[PDB]
Short mmCIF file of C-alpha atoms in Angstrom, two decimals:
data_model
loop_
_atom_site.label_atom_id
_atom_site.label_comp_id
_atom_site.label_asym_id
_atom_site.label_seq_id
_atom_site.Cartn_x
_atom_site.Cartn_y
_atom_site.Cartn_z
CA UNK A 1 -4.18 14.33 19.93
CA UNK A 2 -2.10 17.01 17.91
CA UNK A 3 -1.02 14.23 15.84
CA UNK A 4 0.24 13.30 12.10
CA UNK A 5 -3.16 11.20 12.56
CA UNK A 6 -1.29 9.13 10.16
CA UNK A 7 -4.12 7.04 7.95
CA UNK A 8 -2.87 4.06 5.85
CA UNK A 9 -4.77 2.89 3.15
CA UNK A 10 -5.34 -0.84 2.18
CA UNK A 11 -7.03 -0.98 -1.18
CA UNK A 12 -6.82 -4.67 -1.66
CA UNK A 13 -8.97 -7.13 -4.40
CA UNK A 14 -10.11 -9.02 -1.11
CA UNK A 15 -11.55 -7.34 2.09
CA UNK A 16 -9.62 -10.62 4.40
CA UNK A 17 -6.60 -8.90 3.04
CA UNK A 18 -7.17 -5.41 4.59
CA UNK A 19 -7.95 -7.47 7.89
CA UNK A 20 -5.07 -9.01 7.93
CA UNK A 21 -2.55 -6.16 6.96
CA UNK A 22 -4.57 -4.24 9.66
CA UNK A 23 -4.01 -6.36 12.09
CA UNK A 24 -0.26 -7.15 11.35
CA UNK A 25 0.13 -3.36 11.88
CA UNK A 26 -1.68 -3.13 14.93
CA UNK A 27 1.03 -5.95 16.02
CA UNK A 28 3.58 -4.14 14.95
CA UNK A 29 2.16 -1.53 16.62
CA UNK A 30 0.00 1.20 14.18
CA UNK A 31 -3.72 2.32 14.27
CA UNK A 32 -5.65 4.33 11.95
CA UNK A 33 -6.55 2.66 8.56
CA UNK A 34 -9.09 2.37 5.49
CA UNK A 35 -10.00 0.39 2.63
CA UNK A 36 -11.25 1.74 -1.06
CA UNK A 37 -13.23 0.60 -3.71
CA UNK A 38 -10.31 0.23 -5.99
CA UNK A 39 -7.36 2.50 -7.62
CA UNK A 40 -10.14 5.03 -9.09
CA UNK A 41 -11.13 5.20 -5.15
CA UNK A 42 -7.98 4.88 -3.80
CA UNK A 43 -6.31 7.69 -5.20
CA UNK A 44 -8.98 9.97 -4.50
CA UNK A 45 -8.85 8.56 -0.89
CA UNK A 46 -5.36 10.41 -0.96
CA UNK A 47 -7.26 13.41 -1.96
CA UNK A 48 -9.11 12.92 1.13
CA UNK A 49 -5.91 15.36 2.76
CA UNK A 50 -2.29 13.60 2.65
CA UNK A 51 -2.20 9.64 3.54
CA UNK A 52 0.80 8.00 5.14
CA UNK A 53 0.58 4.98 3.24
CA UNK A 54 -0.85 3.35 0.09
CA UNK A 55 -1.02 -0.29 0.13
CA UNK A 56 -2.59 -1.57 -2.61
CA UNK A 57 -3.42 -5.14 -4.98
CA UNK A 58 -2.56 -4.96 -8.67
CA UNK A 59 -5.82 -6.80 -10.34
CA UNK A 60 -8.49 -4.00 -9.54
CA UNK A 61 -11.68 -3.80 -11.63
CA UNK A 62 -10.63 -0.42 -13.31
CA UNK A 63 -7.39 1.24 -12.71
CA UNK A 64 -4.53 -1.32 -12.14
CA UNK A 65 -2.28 -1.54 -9.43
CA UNK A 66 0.44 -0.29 -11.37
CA UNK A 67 -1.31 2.66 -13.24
CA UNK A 68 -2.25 3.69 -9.60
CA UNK A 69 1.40 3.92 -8.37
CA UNK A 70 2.75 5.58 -11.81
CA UNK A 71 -0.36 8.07 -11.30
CA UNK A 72 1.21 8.70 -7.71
CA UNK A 73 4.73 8.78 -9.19
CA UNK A 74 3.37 11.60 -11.64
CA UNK A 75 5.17 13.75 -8.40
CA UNK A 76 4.83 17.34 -7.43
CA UNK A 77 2.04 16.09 -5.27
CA UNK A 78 1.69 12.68 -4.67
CA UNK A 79 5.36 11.51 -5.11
CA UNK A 80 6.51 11.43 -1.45
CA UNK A 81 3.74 8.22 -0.60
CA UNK A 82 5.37 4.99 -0.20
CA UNK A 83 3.21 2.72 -2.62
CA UNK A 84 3.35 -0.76 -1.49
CA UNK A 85 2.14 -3.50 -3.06
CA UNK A 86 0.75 -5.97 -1.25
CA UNK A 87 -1.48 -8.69 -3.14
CA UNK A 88 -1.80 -12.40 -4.05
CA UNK A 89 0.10 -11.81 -7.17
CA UNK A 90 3.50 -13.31 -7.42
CA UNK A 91 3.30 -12.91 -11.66
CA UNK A 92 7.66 -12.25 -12.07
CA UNK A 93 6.54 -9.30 -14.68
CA UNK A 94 4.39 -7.75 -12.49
CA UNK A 95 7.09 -8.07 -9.78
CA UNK A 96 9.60 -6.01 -12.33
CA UNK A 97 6.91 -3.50 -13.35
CA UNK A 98 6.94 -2.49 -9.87
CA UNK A 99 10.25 -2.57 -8.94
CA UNK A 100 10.07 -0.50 -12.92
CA UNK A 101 7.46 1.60 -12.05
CA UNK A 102 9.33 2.34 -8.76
CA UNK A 103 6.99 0.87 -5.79
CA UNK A 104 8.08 1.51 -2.09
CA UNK A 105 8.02 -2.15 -2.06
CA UNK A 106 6.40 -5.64 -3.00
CA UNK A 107 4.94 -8.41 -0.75
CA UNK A 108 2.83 -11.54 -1.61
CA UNK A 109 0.76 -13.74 0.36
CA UNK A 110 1.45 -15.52 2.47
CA UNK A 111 2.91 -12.51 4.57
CA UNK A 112 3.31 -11.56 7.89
CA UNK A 113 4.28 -8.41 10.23
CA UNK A 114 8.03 -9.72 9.61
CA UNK A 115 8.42 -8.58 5.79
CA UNK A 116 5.45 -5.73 6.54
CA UNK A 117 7.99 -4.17 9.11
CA UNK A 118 10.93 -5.28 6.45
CA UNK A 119 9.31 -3.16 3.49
CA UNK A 120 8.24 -0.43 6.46
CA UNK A 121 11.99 -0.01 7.48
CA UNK A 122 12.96 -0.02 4.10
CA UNK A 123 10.78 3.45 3.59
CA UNK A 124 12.14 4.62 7.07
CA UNK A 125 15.77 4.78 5.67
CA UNK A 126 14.98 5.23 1.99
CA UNK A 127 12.87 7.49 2.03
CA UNK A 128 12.93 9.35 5.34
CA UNK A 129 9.76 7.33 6.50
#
């Protein structure tokens, strides 16, 4: 009712993976969540009010995984969202750009609700999550 009405986002390259981080939440125990087009979308999705999470690939067809977190960590607005990348992509460089570009957090397939709820409690106690 008089919620947060928290919405996650889950802007992944492949729909399967929004399914699955979905449902991993919904183990762990979450609701509320939506996809985007890509990065262009996905940030604009935040502009949709104030998000609780951005989970996103790196490989999208126009702005990058990375360009959409260092857009988010422009700050004054955006800054507080845990970006958390969550993709096929194990590339070591990407990896460091992330941990660089200062991500939330970093998970690649294969995955479960075990490292979801790792990176999750990570943002609880880092960031006040």
């Amino acid at each position: 009712m008089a919620d947060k009405e928290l919405k996650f986002l889950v802007v992944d390259d492949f729909s399967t993976m929004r399914r699955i981080v979905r449902n991993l939440l919904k183990e762990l125990g979450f609701n509320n969540v939506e996809e985007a087009e890509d990065g262009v979308d996905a940030l604009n999705k935040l502009q949709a009010g104030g998000y609780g999470f951005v989970i996103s690939d790196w490989n999208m067809p126009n702005m990058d995984g990375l360009e959409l977190l260092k857009t988010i960590r422009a700050d004054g607005a955006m800054s507080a969202l845990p970006v958390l990348m969550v993709t096929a992509e194990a590339k070591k460089e990407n990896i460091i750009a992330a941990a660089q570009a200062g991500a939330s957090g970093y998970v690649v397939k294969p995955f479960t609700a075990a490292t979801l709820e790792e990176k999750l409690n990570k943002i609880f106690e880092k960031l006040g999550m």
